[PDB]
Amino acid sequence: VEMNVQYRVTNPEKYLYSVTSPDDSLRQATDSALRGVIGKYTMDRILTEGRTVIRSDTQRELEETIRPYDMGITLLDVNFQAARPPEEVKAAFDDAIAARENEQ
Amino acid sequence: YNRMRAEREAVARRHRSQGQEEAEKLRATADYEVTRTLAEAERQGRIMRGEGDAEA
Amino acid sequence: YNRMRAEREAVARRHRSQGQEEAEKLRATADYEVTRTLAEAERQGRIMRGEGDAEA
Amino acid sequence: QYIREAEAYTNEVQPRANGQAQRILEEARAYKAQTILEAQGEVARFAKLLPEY
């Protein structure tokens, strides 16, 4: 699973005289938030509903977790640039999905 | 990884067999109809060959 | 070292043993069902052939 | 994995048996029509030759 974030600074002084090196904190907490959302849901559900159920939850969790650090950034949104859940090792459900048309 | 693969190929071949089932099912009716019509034709042919033999 | 290795290797083997055992246990009943399904149709066919013979 | 493969084998071996059963039954049905029509043909053919004799 992969995603993408868009961020914006409101108060510069909190962006300077606080936790250092902003992109480090942003990315390196977003990973934890993404784990938090992706964890609880089953494989098929992640395959099917990847664009509705998970994204709002990752919004809420990431916005919550950036709060205590008291840094200054406001999130635009998070999007879903691409989805490739079947692992690259065995992305051979092309047989499994072409099976239904071959059956009909 | 292999466990996933096994389950997934199992579902695939299940669909294979499920289709092939009624696929083979449907041919029996066609064979039945062709046999029946040929039998009727043979009956009529025998009748009129009998006509010919009797007059001879 | 060899003692420890042999012990837990034996554990793994016994697990795989129960696995394969249940495998053949299911495989047998599959074939049972197959043979029953064929026998039923054989009975039906014999009945129909008898009816045809009686009429003839 | 072994358990899943074994339990999958059932549904991949049984429907083929159903298909074979239907084939057998259909052929059995066809035989009756063939034999009855042939019998009618033979009787009708003989009945006309007898008065010629």
Short mmCIF file of C-alpha atoms in Angstrom, two decimals:
data_model
loop_
_atom_site.label_atom_id
_atom_site.label_comp_id
_atom_site.label_asym_id
_atom_site.label_seq_id
_atom_site.Cartn_x
_atom_site.Cartn_y
_atom_site.Cartn_z
CA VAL A 1 0.00 0.00 0.00
CA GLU A 2 1.18 3.51 -0.79
CA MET A 3 -0.25 7.01 -0.40
CA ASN A 4 0.77 10.66 -0.53
CA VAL A 5 0.38 13.79 1.60
CA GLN A 6 0.12 17.53 0.96
CA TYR A 7 1.07 19.92 3.74
CA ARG A 8 1.03 23.65 4.42
CA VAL A 9 2.63 25.92 7.03
CA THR A 10 0.55 28.43 8.99
CA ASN A 11 2.73 29.75 11.82
CA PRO A 12 6.39 29.94 10.75
CA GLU A 13 7.95 30.33 14.19
CA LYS A 14 6.59 26.99 15.36
CA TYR A 15 8.00 25.62 12.11
CA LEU A 16 11.46 26.92 13.04
CA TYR A 17 11.88 26.88 16.82
CA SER A 18 10.41 23.46 17.55
CA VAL A 19 11.15 19.86 16.57
CA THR A 20 13.83 20.13 13.92
CA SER A 21 14.10 18.97 10.30
CA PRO A 22 10.41 19.04 9.35
CA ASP A 23 10.20 16.49 6.53
CA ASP A 24 11.84 13.96 8.83
CA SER A 25 9.08 14.26 11.43
CA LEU A 26 6.33 14.37 8.82
CA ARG A 27 7.34 11.29 6.81
CA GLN A 28 8.64 9.36 9.78
CA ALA A 29 5.36 9.69 11.65
CA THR A 30 3.17 9.17 8.57
CA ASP A 31 4.63 5.69 8.28
CA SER A 32 3.41 4.83 11.79
CA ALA A 33 -0.04 6.24 11.06
CA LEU A 34 -0.25 4.18 7.87
CA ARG A 35 0.58 1.04 9.82
CA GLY A 36 -2.06 1.95 12.37
CA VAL A 37 -4.79 2.13 9.75
CA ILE A 38 -3.67 -0.78 7.57
CA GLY A 39 -3.40 -3.21 10.46
CA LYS A 40 -6.92 -4.17 11.46
CA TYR A 41 -8.49 -4.92 8.08
CA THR A 42 -8.42 -8.21 6.18
CA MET A 43 -6.61 -8.84 2.91
CA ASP A 44 -9.68 -8.98 0.67
CA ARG A 45 -11.16 -5.82 2.19
CA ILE A 46 -7.91 -3.93 1.61
CA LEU A 47 -8.04 -5.20 -1.98
CA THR A 48 -11.59 -4.02 -2.59
CA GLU A 49 -12.35 -0.86 -0.57
CA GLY A 50 -8.88 0.69 -0.50
CA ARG A 51 -10.18 4.15 -1.41
CA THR A 52 -13.02 4.89 1.04
CA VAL A 53 -12.79 3.15 4.41
CA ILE A 54 -9.07 3.51 5.15
CA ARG A 55 -8.26 7.03 4.00
CA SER A 56 -10.47 9.04 6.38
CA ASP A 57 -9.14 6.97 9.27
CA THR A 58 -5.55 7.68 8.27
CA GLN A 59 -6.53 11.35 8.14
CA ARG A 60 -7.87 11.31 11.68
CA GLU A 61 -4.99 9.28 13.13
CA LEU A 62 -2.23 11.31 11.48
CA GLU A 63 -3.81 14.62 12.44
CA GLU A 64 -4.16 13.34 15.99
CA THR A 65 -0.57 12.12 16.23
CA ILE A 66 1.01 15.30 14.86
CA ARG A 67 -0.89 17.31 17.50
CA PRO A 68 1.12 16.58 20.70
CA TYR A 69 4.45 17.34 19.02
CA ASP A 70 3.10 20.91 18.74
CA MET A 71 4.75 21.55 15.38
CA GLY A 72 3.27 24.00 12.91
CA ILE A 73 1.76 22.43 9.78
CA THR A 74 -1.82 21.96 8.59
CA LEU A 75 -2.71 19.02 6.35
CA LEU A 76 -4.34 19.59 3.01
CA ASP A 77 -5.51 16.00 2.53
CA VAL A 78 -4.19 12.55 1.72
CA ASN A 79 -4.84 10.90 -1.68
CA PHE A 80 -4.43 7.42 -3.28
CA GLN A 81 -2.00 7.84 -6.23
CA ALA A 82 -1.83 4.07 -6.97
CA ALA A 83 -2.90 0.72 -5.41
CA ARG A 84 -0.87 -2.52 -5.82
CA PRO A 85 -1.81 -4.79 -2.82
CA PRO A 86 -0.99 -8.26 -4.41
CA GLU A 87 2.70 -8.79 -3.61
CA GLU A 88 5.14 -8.50 -6.51
CA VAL A 89 6.39 -12.04 -5.89
CA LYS A 90 3.17 -13.73 -7.01
CA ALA A 91 1.10 -11.10 -8.84
CA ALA A 92 -0.35 -14.05 -10.78
CA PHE A 93 -4.04 -13.63 -9.99
CA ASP A 94 -4.29 -12.65 -13.63
CA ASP A 95 -5.01 -16.35 -14.01
CA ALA A 96 -7.42 -16.19 -11.07
CA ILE A 97 -9.28 -13.19 -12.50
CA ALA A 98 -9.16 -14.31 -16.13
CA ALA A 99 -10.64 -17.57 -14.86
CA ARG A 100 -14.17 -16.18 -14.68
CA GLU A 101 -14.30 -14.97 -18.28
CA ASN A 102 -12.67 -18.19 -19.47
CA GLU A 103 -15.37 -20.04 -17.53
CA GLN A 104 -18.19 -18.06 -19.12
CA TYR B 1 3.73 -16.72 0.34
CA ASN B 2 3.19 -20.28 -0.86
CA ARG B 3 0.14 -20.71 1.38
CA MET B 4 -1.51 -17.72 -0.30
CA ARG B 5 -0.59 -19.10 -3.72
CA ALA B 6 -2.12 -22.48 -2.92
CA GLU B 7 -5.45 -21.01 -1.82
CA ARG B 8 -5.58 -18.73 -4.84
CA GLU B 9 -4.87 -21.43 -7.45
CA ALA B 10 -7.43 -23.64 -5.72
CA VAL B 11 -10.14 -21.02 -6.25
CA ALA B 12 -9.08 -20.60 -9.88
CA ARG B 13 -9.30 -24.30 -10.73
CA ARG B 14 -12.61 -24.51 -8.86
CA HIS B 15 -14.06 -22.02 -11.33
CA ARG B 16 -12.53 -24.01 -14.19
CA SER B 17 -14.30 -27.21 -13.16
CA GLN B 18 -17.57 -25.46 -12.31
CA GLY B 19 -17.83 -24.11 -15.85
CA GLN B 20 -16.78 -27.35 -17.53
CA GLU B 21 -19.57 -29.13 -15.63
CA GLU B 22 -22.61 -27.56 -17.26
CA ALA B 23 -20.58 -27.17 -20.45
CA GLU B 24 -20.48 -30.96 -20.77
CA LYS B 25 -24.05 -31.11 -19.42
CA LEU B 26 -25.50 -29.26 -22.39
CA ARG B 27 -24.15 -31.59 -25.14
CA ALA B 28 -26.28 -34.56 -24.08
CA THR B 29 -29.51 -32.93 -25.23
CA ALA B 30 -28.06 -32.24 -28.68
CA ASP B 31 -26.92 -35.84 -29.06
CA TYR B 32 -30.36 -37.03 -27.94
CA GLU B 33 -32.15 -34.91 -30.54
CA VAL B 34 -29.89 -35.96 -33.41
CA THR B 35 -30.31 -39.63 -32.53
CA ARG B 36 -34.10 -39.29 -32.33
CA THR B 37 -34.46 -37.61 -35.72
CA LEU B 38 -32.19 -40.13 -37.43
CA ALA B 39 -34.24 -42.97 -35.93
CA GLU B 40 -37.44 -41.49 -37.35
CA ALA B 41 -35.84 -41.23 -40.78
CA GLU B 42 -34.74 -44.86 -40.62
CA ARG B 43 -38.29 -45.93 -39.75
CA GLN B 44 -39.75 -44.21 -42.80
CA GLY B 45 -37.07 -45.67 -45.06
CA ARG B 46 -37.78 -49.19 -43.84
CA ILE B 47 -41.51 -48.74 -44.46
CA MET B 48 -41.15 -47.80 -48.09
CA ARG B 49 -38.44 -50.37 -48.81
CA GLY B 50 -41.04 -52.86 -47.62
CA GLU B 51 -43.47 -51.39 -50.15
CA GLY B 52 -40.97 -52.03 -52.92
CA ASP B 53 -40.21 -55.59 -51.87
CA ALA B 54 -43.89 -56.51 -51.61
CA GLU B 55 -44.71 -55.28 -55.11
CA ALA B 56 -41.67 -57.07 -56.55
CA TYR C 1 24.09 -29.41 19.54
CA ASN C 2 23.11 -32.48 17.53
CA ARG C 3 20.86 -33.68 20.35
CA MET C 4 18.86 -30.45 20.38
CA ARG C 5 18.59 -30.35 16.60
CA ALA C 6 17.35 -33.93 16.38
CA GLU C 7 14.73 -33.34 19.07
CA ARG C 8 13.00 -30.40 17.47
CA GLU C 9 13.34 -31.93 14.00
CA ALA C 10 11.36 -34.91 15.31
CA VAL C 11 8.70 -32.48 16.56
CA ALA C 12 8.38 -30.96 13.09
CA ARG C 13 8.10 -34.40 11.50
CA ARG C 14 5.26 -35.49 13.78
CA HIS C 15 3.29 -32.33 12.97
CA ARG C 16 3.63 -32.96 9.24
CA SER C 17 2.51 -36.54 9.92
CA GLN C 18 -0.87 -35.50 11.31
CA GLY C 19 -1.23 -33.17 8.35
CA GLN C 20 -0.77 -35.81 5.69
CA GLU C 21 -2.94 -38.26 7.65
CA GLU C 22 -5.98 -36.01 7.55
CA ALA C 23 -5.23 -35.45 3.86
CA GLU C 24 -5.76 -39.06 2.83
CA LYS C 25 -8.70 -39.40 5.21
CA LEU C 26 -10.61 -36.78 3.22
CA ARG C 27 -9.39 -37.99 -0.17
CA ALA C 28 -10.99 -41.41 0.41
CA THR C 29 -14.51 -40.11 1.09
CA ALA C 30 -14.34 -38.00 -2.06
CA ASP C 31 -14.00 -41.13 -4.20
CA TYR C 32 -16.77 -42.85 -2.25
CA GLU C 33 -19.17 -40.08 -3.20
CA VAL C 34 -18.08 -40.34 -6.83
CA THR C 35 -18.82 -44.06 -7.02
CA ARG C 36 -22.24 -43.71 -5.39
CA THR C 37 -23.17 -41.00 -7.89
CA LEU C 38 -22.28 -43.26 -10.81
CA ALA C 39 -24.13 -46.29 -9.42
CA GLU C 40 -27.41 -44.38 -9.08
CA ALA C 41 -27.41 -43.44 -12.77
CA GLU C 42 -26.55 -47.01 -13.70
CA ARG C 43 -29.71 -48.20 -11.94
CA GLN C 44 -31.83 -45.62 -13.75
CA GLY C 45 -30.44 -46.63 -17.13
CA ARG C 46 -31.15 -50.30 -16.50
CA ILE C 47 -34.76 -49.41 -15.67
CA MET C 48 -35.27 -47.49 -18.91
CA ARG C 49 -33.74 -50.25 -21.03
CA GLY C 50 -36.09 -52.77 -19.43
CA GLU C 51 -39.09 -50.61 -20.29
CA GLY C 52 -38.02 -50.38 -23.93
CA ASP C 53 -37.56 -54.14 -24.14
CA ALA C 54 -41.03 -54.77 -22.70
CA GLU C 55 -42.71 -52.52 -25.26
CA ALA C 56 -40.80 -54.10 -28.15
CA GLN D 1 -1.73 -25.98 3.37
CA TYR D 2 -2.18 -29.74 3.11
CA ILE D 3 -5.64 -29.50 4.68
CA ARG D 4 -6.74 -26.75 2.29
CA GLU D 5 -5.49 -28.61 -0.78
CA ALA D 6 -7.23 -31.80 0.32
CA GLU D 7 -10.54 -30.07 1.02
CA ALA D 8 -10.30 -28.33 -2.34
CA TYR D 9 -9.88 -31.63 -4.19
CA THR D 10 -13.46 -32.67 -3.37
CA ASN D 11 -15.18 -29.86 -5.27
CA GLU D 12 -12.82 -30.34 -8.21
CA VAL D 13 -13.44 -34.07 -8.54
CA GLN D 14 -17.19 -34.38 -7.86
CA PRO D 15 -18.91 -32.18 -10.52
CA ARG D 16 -17.17 -34.16 -13.26
CA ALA D 17 -18.90 -37.22 -11.82
CA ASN D 18 -22.22 -35.39 -12.05
CA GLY D 19 -21.53 -34.68 -15.72
CA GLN D 20 -20.70 -38.29 -16.46
CA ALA D 21 -23.90 -39.37 -14.70
CA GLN D 22 -26.04 -37.11 -16.85
CA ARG D 23 -24.30 -38.37 -20.00
CA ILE D 24 -25.05 -41.97 -19.01
CA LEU D 25 -28.70 -41.21 -18.31
CA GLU D 26 -29.19 -39.38 -21.61
CA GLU D 27 -27.68 -42.22 -23.64
CA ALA D 28 -29.90 -44.68 -21.80
CA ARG D 29 -32.94 -42.61 -22.76
CA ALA D 30 -31.88 -42.47 -26.42
CA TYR D 31 -31.59 -46.26 -26.65
CA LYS D 32 -35.29 -46.75 -25.91
CA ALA D 33 -36.52 -44.48 -28.69
CA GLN D 34 -34.17 -46.11 -31.17
CA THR D 35 -35.29 -49.64 -30.35
CA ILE D 36 -39.02 -48.87 -30.37
CA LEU D 37 -38.86 -47.12 -33.74
CA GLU D 38 -36.86 -50.01 -35.20
CA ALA D 39 -39.42 -52.50 -33.90
CA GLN D 40 -42.27 -50.60 -35.54
CA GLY D 41 -40.32 -50.54 -38.80
CA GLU D 42 -39.75 -54.29 -38.76
CA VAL D 43 -43.35 -55.20 -37.95
CA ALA D 44 -44.77 -52.92 -40.62
CA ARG D 45 -42.34 -54.26 -43.22
CA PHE D 46 -43.28 -57.89 -42.50
CA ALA D 47 -47.03 -57.28 -42.38
CA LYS D 48 -47.06 -56.22 -46.04
CA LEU D 49 -44.92 -59.10 -47.28
CA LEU D 50 -47.15 -61.73 -45.70
CA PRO D 51 -50.18 -61.17 -48.01
CA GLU D 52 -47.85 -61.29 -51.01
CA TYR D 53 -47.14 -64.83 -49.83
#
